[PDB]
């Protein structure tokens, strides 16, 4: 029974939403409507400022909203907790991109290149070749061209971990 958050509901008890509800109001000090940052961890990590990483974190949870309602309540991290997201949420904002592309745009081209792109994993220390990422930009296309342009971008992360 139950889809997957009215199931642990039986064996989970409503009182924590009052439990983590301290933490919450605190991280929410200067958000009106509950908008904050999920990761608890990655804070913690970055605050003591160390080598880079979480820095990313905060990008994926930017736009965790995949509803797509603007904020996130109290009670939909609880019931992230029966399904463990483990790791991972979205990829770069609606009105980020907008920045992100002519940010990555080094060329002052207008078009977006390999080294400016993969650049990026460059420095954080990801797990690939220097090269795979050339198959990466191949993707980038969508206009029909053979390069990023000012739509491109966007639809870049389609849907990529």
């Given at each position: 029974m139950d889809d997957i958050y009215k199931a642990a509901v039986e064996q989970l008890t409503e009182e924590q939403k009052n439990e983590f509800k301290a933490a919450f109001d605190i991280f929410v000090?200067?958000?009106?409507?509950?908008?904050?940052?999920?990761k608890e961890l990655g804070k913690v990590m970055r605050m003591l400022g160390?080598?880079?990483?979480?820095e990313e974190l905060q990008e994926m949870i930017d736009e965790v909203d995949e509803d797509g309602s603007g904020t996130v309540d109290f009670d939909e991290f609880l019931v992230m907790m029966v399904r463990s997201m483990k790791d991972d949420s979205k990829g770069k904002s609606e009105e980020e991109l907008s920045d992100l592309f002519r940010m990555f745009d080094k060329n002052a081209d207008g078009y977006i290149d390999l080294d400016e792109l993969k650049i990026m994993l460059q420095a954080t220390?990801?797990?690939?070749?220097?090269?795979?990422i050339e198959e990466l930009m191949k993707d980038?296309?969508?206009?029909?061209?053979?390069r990023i342009d000012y739509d491109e971008w966007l639809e870049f992360m389609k849907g990529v971990e």
């Amino acid at each position: 029974m139950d889809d997957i958050y009215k199931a642990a509901v039986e064996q989970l008890t409503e009182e924590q939403k009052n439990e983590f509800k301290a933490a919450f109001d605190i991280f929410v000090l200067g958000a009106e409507d509950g908008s904050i940052s999920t990761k608890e961890l990655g804070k913690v990590m970055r605050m003591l400022g160390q080598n880079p990483t979480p820095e990313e974190l905060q990008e994926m949870i930017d736009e965790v909203d995949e509803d797509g309602s603007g904020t996130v309540d109290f009670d939909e991290f609880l019931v992230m907790m029966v399904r463990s997201m483990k790791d991972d949420s979205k990829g770069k904002s609606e009105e980020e991109l907008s920045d992100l592309f002519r940010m990555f745009d080094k060329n002052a081209d207008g078009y977006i290149d390999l080294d400016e792109l993969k650049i990026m994993l460059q420095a954080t220390g990801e797990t690939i070749t220097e090269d795979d990422i050339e198959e990466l930009m191949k993707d980038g296309d969508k206009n029909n061209d053979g390069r990023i342009d000012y739509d491109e971008w966007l639809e870049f992360m389609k849907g990529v971990e």
